Design a protein around this motif. Structure first.
Motif, mmCIF file in Angstrom:
data_model
loop_
_atom_site.group_PDB
_atom_site.id
_atom_site.type_symbol
_atom_site.label_atom_id
_atom_site.label_comp_id
_atom_site.label_asym_id
_atom_site.label_seq_id
_atom_site.Cartn_x
_atom_site.Cartn_y
_atom_site.Cartn_z
ATOM 1 N N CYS E 5 45.390 45.563 46.244
ATOM 2 C CA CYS E 5 44.344 45.335 47.172
ATOM 3 C C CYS E 5 44.106 43.781 47.405
ATOM 4 C CB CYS E 5 42.874 45.876 46.610
ATOM 5 S SG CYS E 5 41.412 44.954 47.442
ATOM 6 N N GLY E 6 44.051 43.284 48.574
ATOM 7 C CA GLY E 6 43.876 42.092 49.007
ATOM 8 C C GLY E 6 44.990 41.039 48.641
ATOM 9 N N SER E 7 45.077 39.998 48.001
ATOM 10 C CA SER E 7 45.917 39.037 47.792
ATOM 11 C C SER E 7 47.244 39.603 46.841
ATOM 12 C CB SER E 7 45.420 37.850 47.016
ATOM 13 O OG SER E 7 44.288 37.503 47.777
ATOM 14 N N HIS E 8 47.007 40.818 46.152
ATOM 15 C CA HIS E 8 48.131 41.571 45.353
ATOM 16 C C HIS E 8 49.098 41.850 46.270
ATOM 17 C CE1 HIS E 8 50.059 43.748 42.383
ATOM 18 N NE2 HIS E 8 48.829 43.995 41.765
ATOM 19 N N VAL E 10 50.305 40.441 48.960
ATOM 20 C CA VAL E 10 51.236 39.392 49.253
ATOM 21 C C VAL E 10 52.253 39.011 48.236
ATOM 22 C CG1 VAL E 10 49.539 37.867 48.984
ATOM 23 C CG2 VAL E 10 51.537 37.258 50.091
#
Lengths: 46, 785, 788, 46, 46, 46
Positions: E5-8, E10
């Protein structure tokens, strides 16, 4: 707030690094300038 | 006899003063409604009196009577039993002309309360203590003239006084006040001598230890715990003949309202309950099978708003209609509902709960188990439309037959609602309208996840560390902490919000969130609890996490200076005194004290002075929305001392009689002391050294100069300041010479010159810093003519 | 030439440094996505440079690039046109971990869009840039960068200009370059080093003044023009018909997805003719011979209008073939863009939904939304409003909005009256249920009571009395009246809150008691704004708004002013003075006139003669309980069958005709009615005159037999009264000088200056007066002789 | 008016019927939450 | 875990496919609001 | 609050009864003791 300077920090660092020791070759411009979290006041002891 | 009159069943005075006058009735057997006396003046209501009514069972109701006081209408009424309340109260005096309550005989209100209100000419009501009068201290009295302080204080006399709200105030007429009985007397009462009345009596007794009213039952001409004759209206007993006579008469009279009395458990109760059968000696026997109650209601709908409405369904097991709970009162009122409705089994109609502020839980339906024969609008057999907080889900079985509302329940959590939905058997047959959409658990989220790792304390700083919990999607705004002083852990807290530390890609190498509450009082104890805040998803509601309340106590430091005087009991003995310091900062282990001596005035020793005459959610949600847009677009699939303990005094001896002494006092709480505390004193001297050693001798020279010979004492606190010399001629007045150390040095002793011829006798007295001592033996001298 | 390169349509750099190198492109004709450069270091990204990219049309996007700065990648980029935004912005630099600075010391204007630099954990020197001269819309969401934690010290070249931001005059983005500020009259045309405005049609910068690096409106060819007069492409340039038709034929020949078959309309090579014209043989869009709809089909009949980029997907559309949901989650209201992008819509064939729309205050941008219920929300609904700042809804007028089929929660700022009016005008009367009607909080702070409320107003310097007509709810429910009033200096409307219970009810409406209040202790001469409100008990099925009063402005009466502050008096001439002071602390009203007096103070009497010649819900359940009880009672017990002068608007004056050194006293009164303040006082000491400091008459001599010398002169009594003393000097022939300090006492003793005990010889003696001012001029010498 | 709500009913009922006062052996739901009529009001006062 | 989720996403996508990076000519709704799988995750990185 | 005493009320009664006049044969114990509404401070003028 909970902002303090000088003696307050010099015996506050004992709470997290009392037995760790501190590096010797300014903490005033790094910690007294604002509110300090653990990561900032523990920089001198690690 | 103690009961000079019969019953006066169901009195109700209305309209003009017509009727009434229906006298000698000590007991009422019903209520008393004197109201709507629209046209009277105190002239019409001054001489009429009923001084011998003592017992009122249900309630006394007065509503807008030109009446000065009740002290003449009911001068000797003692107890309102309050078996059947009006709304929730037994004494309701509501809404114009009056002087005072009077009723200086009223003692106890068994069950109920008092609701005097909106009497625009009423005062002298805050000067009454209800603790010894009312069973339930929680008596709604507002909107009366005493509120605006227009009525000055008047009390007879002289009269007793109690403590209310921490204020010791006197306790209701101009000639009578409260009759306080000893606490050991309980409701039995007391006489003028303080002797407790007999236990079975109630309120007052004609003579001690034998009664005006009965506590439990009356029997005949006495007071008893329970009649042993082979019970009526919970207050007396009658023979079987009277009960069966009433039962036959009312069904013969066809009068509406009677209950065909049936004997059960040696009580002439209205009807046998659900489980027994009426009847030939008419003793209720257990049913030979199931016997329901099915108490039909008006159009199948009733409002349970207060005790009087609940009592309409006492003993019922089945409700033939619907029920709505609409308690709009401040007091919780939980016990009465359990007794009145706890014996119910199922509601054949629908159920509704609306504006039930007083309710905190819904446990009083202790046997509610099962119908949907009637439905609320929208086809619903249940309802909840601001203080509800808790059914207790267990083997206790509550299932519905048909039907499907949970709105505006700020103190109701979602987990209990879902569990109720599950256990009800409504799984698979519910829509979102049935489930809660309005605020539920706004302040009572009660997160289903638990949260502490590392605790460190100091006299001014405390460190707490707790394990990091992340929501299913890495939504967490941060952690807000609450901590406040808890002297005895008997739990308003301080509020500090902390953002979480930076996320670590490895769960093993995470950073535990931590905080330091700085500047805390040493030795003080506190209670701490922390909470988690997440973004709200309507279809994906997440509670967050919770931490149990924990108590820690700060470490101690040095105490403060004790807050000191010294007074001597003997010439060589002194007694120390002081008071405890302002703040101990911990239990004081010992008060360290020193003693010291201070020197006298060196200058005075020799010098002569003989001369005489949502704001941030949209900010964070906007940040989560963007990153979703980015990824969805850019990712295209394929000194000697001593210690004192617990004492504010001490004794020191072996000191000088007048020399000043100095005391140094240290307060210590570790065995670490405070800064010095100091005090001095001046004890009463001794006159032993104030007297000149050795008598006085005389010498005479040729020029009539007289020299006196004595020894100098140097004991009284050092050097003696001066001497006093007295001499008197034979048959003449007295003369004196003030001899100091300086004159003693000049003349090598006291010398007298220029005196008139004659015979003289001269005495010498020492004068130390303490004062003038004893005189010496006289000596004589002569001057030639 | 000013455009040394061609277009570079739709560049997108991804994965490794592979591709790219596609140079000399001054214009881009598309966006620029350089992102996901996961493995580079500044060594890999130091020498590469594209110094001749000047024009970017849509947006520049950088996402997680080992790149130091863009000052070498794009050293000469000037304007981002921003015709097609990414989300709401044209410059989004996000999460690019490694960096040194932005660079881009040529960037001048961003036409339409914004900047959204964020989450660059190694970024600073961003608060030292002024966007006022750069960005059309000053309302640039930049957070979560290293400059937030103050870990980066201030560095500016030098030397560089400085502007004012948030009231702070701060310098304005590299270590060698800063902002190129142009004069405000130059607008977006630009300026040269001499300050000469560039030609109007230029944009940002010009090679030479008054002739351009970029064009403001259109390019034409080798110049900048307002509009091409050749017989428009992408809103920035013009081409011949041949190129436009060539593209139109090529893309339909190439079968490439994404092309729009270009059709000429209004001398513009726009993608397609709008709803109202028809495509085509010279392909000029002619008006349709009948109704021509748009019907822009959507993905599975549902689209999310979350920002400008989503709205632009439906520009020119008149009919939406699917559903629409409005989900704007941004702080800025963003109202103008939606009106342009969606205002030309007519009806939504699918359902409509609005959720979490903070930015919306009204819903007027649907300027032509008139009519379907072909698709329904869950629960069979062709409308929705789920969850907090919506305040107006449609403006109900001849504007016709009716629904065909289908059937309001969490709307705190939406009133009930507008909701009911929408229900009525929709044609849903008689076909709605309570689920359709609002049950959640609607108008919690925006009740907007439909009843109007003032009768008697009285003011005083510290107290104001207001009286207003009493209005009772349908059932005599009224908790009371709470009042709000605060200072309104210019009625340009935070107020004080006081709650008052109503007076006792009167059985006769004629003899009612009007509620009134006194707000005491108010500042005199000050103006305030007042509005009052009514509170009623809440009945769910009998909702009552209460009553409302219009905001009114009153101003307090004036009183005496304060003492004028810091008065000083300085003399310009010996007999003339100039007084000075600055206005008092609080005028308490416009000061009508400053009353001033003048007074004289005497000298020191003791010094005149004495000799000193020596030298060396909580209450609802309370009130509702009482309404419940009385209902129970009735239902049960009612069974049925000195000279002065005024100064105005000046802190100075001149006073003349005074003594040369005698101290003078000034009394000053400040008055605001023609009523003054208490006295203000000040003194001064002007420069004296030496005319009286000189002794009148020369000195004569007399000699006695005992060599005693007497001198004869006249006493001046003019210099501020009695003269304190004299100074006498005498010198022997060819010897040094000797003096005698003669005071009034010695003058009285010897009846004039006398000299005794002097050595024999010839002498000459002079006398000088010494007033309180000082020592004056000397007199004519006289001689005396002492016998040997 | 005739909106006899709360303390209005008690003060107005003696302006309707006082000759026999009020009959004894509801009212709010029909003459307090709505408008009562002289046809139905006098019944409550006999 | 696998809740990217989110910046995980990338930071984790280069631990899945980096040989050809990511294909170019959604993701949050199927691997950010839920649990993604290695069968479907590698498509988003070509 | 808005509580005052003495000259404050002696000049405040002018605001409601300036031209009415005041009765002459204590206002201190009736009005200075707490917050005063119009009905209490107008008792001396009517």
């Amino acid at each position: 707030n909970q902002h303090l300077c000088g003696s307050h920090l010099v015996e506050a660092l004992y709470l997290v690094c009392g037995e760790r020791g501190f590096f010797y070759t300014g903490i005033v411009e790094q910690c007294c300038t604002s509110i300090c979290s653990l990561y900032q006041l523990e920089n001198y002891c690690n | 006899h103690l009961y000079p009159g019969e019953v006066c069943p169901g009195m109700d005075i209305r309209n003009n003063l017509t009727r009434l006058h229906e006298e000698n009735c000590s007991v009422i057997e019903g209520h008393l409604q004197i109201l709507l006396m629209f046209k009277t003046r105190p002239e019409d209501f001054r001489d009429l009196s009923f001084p011998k009514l003592i017992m009122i069972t249900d309630y006394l109701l007065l509503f807008r009577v030109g009446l000065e006081s009740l002290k003449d209408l009911f001068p000797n009424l003692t107890v309102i039993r309050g078996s059947r309340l009006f709304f929730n109260y037994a004494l309701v005096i509501f809404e114009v002309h009056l002087k005072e309550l009077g009723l200086y005989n009223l003692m106890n209100i068994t069950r109920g309360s008092v609701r005097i209100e909106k009497n625009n000419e009423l005062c002298y009501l805050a000067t009454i203590d209800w603790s010894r009068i009312l069973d339930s201290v929680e008596n709604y009295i507002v909107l009366n003239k005493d509120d605006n302080e227009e009525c000055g204080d008047i009390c007879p006399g002289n009269c007793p006084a109690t403590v209310i709200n921490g204020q010791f105030v006197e306790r209701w007429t101009h000639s009578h006040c409260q009759k306080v009985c000893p606490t050991i007397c309980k409701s039995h009462g007391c006489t003028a001598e303080g002797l407790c009345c007999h236990s079975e009596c109630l309120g007052n007794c004609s003579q001690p230890d034998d009664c005006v009213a009965c506590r439990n039952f009356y029997l005949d001409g006495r007071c008893v715990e329970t009649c042993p004759p082979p019970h009526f209206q919970d207050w007396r007993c009658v023979n079987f003949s009277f009960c069966q006579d009433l039962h036959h008469k009312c069904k013969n009279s066809r009068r509406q309202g009677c209950h065909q009395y049936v004997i059960h458990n040696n009580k002439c109760i209205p009807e046998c309950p659900s489980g027994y059968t009426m009847n030939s000696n008419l003793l209720c026997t257990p049913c030979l099978g199931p016997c329901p109650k099915v108490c039909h209601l008006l159009e199948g709908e009733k409002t349970i708003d207060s005790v009087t409405s609940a009592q309409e369904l006492r003993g019922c097991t089945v409700i033939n209609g619907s029920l709505i709970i609409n308690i709009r009162g401040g007091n919780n009122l939980a016990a009465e509902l359990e007794a009145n409705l706890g014996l119910i089994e199922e509601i054949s109609g629908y159920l509704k709960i609306r504006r039930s502020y007083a309710l905190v839980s819904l446990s009083f339906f202790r046997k509610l188990r099962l119908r949907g024969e009637t439905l609320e609008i929208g086809n619903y057999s249940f309802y909840a439309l601001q203080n509800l907080r808790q059914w207790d889900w267990s083997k206790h079985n509550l299932t519905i037959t048909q039907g499907k509302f949970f709105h505006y329940n700020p103190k109701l959590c979602l987990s209990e609602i879902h569990k109720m939905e599950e256990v009800s058997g409504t799984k698979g047959r519910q829509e979102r309208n049935d489930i809660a959409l309005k605020t539920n658990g706004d302040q009572a989220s009660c997160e289903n996840e638990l949260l502490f790792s590392y605790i460190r304390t100091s006299f001014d700083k405390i460190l707490l560390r707790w394990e990091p919990y992340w929501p299913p999607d890495f939504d967490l705004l941060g952690f807000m902490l609450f901590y406040k002083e808890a002297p005895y852990q008997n739990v308003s807290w301080t509020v500090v919000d902390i953002d979480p530390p930076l996320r670590s890609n490895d769960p093993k190498s995470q950073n535990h969130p931590g905080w330091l509450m700085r500047g805390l009082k040493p030795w003080t104890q506190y209670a701490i609890f922390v909470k988690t805040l997440v973004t709200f998803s309507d279809e994906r509601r997440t509670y967050g996490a919770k931490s149990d309340i924990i108590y820690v106590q700060t470490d101690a430091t040095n105490p403060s200076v004790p807050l000191p005087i010294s007074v001597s009991n003997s010439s060589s003995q002194i007694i120390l005194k002081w008071k405890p310091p302002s703040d101990p900062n911990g239990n004081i282990t010992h008060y360290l004290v020193f003693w010291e001596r201070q020197a006298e005035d060196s200058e005075l020793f020799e010098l002569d002075y003989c001369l005489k005459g949502l704001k941030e959610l949209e900010e964070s949600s906007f940040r989560k929305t963007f990153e979703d847009y980015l990824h969805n677009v850019v990712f295209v699939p394929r000194r000697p001392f001593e210690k004192v303990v617990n004492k504010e005094s001490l004794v020191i001896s072996g000191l000088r009689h007048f020399t000043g002494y100095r005391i140094e006092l240290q307060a210590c709480n570790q065995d670490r002391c405070s800064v010095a505390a100091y005090v001095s004193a001046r004890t009463m001297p001794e006159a032993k050294a104030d007297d000149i050693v050795g008598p006085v001798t005389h010498e005479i020279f040729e020029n009539n100069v007289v020299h006196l010979m004595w020894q100098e004492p140097k004991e009284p606190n050092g050097l003696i300041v001066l001497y006093e010399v007295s001499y008197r001629r034979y048959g003449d007045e007295e003369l004196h010479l003030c001899v100091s150390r300086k004159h003693f040095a000049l003349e090598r002793g006291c010398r007298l010159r220029g005196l008139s011829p004659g015979n003289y006798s001269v005495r010498i007295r020492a004068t130390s810093l303490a004062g003038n001592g004893s005189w010496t033996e006289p000596t004589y001298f002569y001057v030639t003519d």
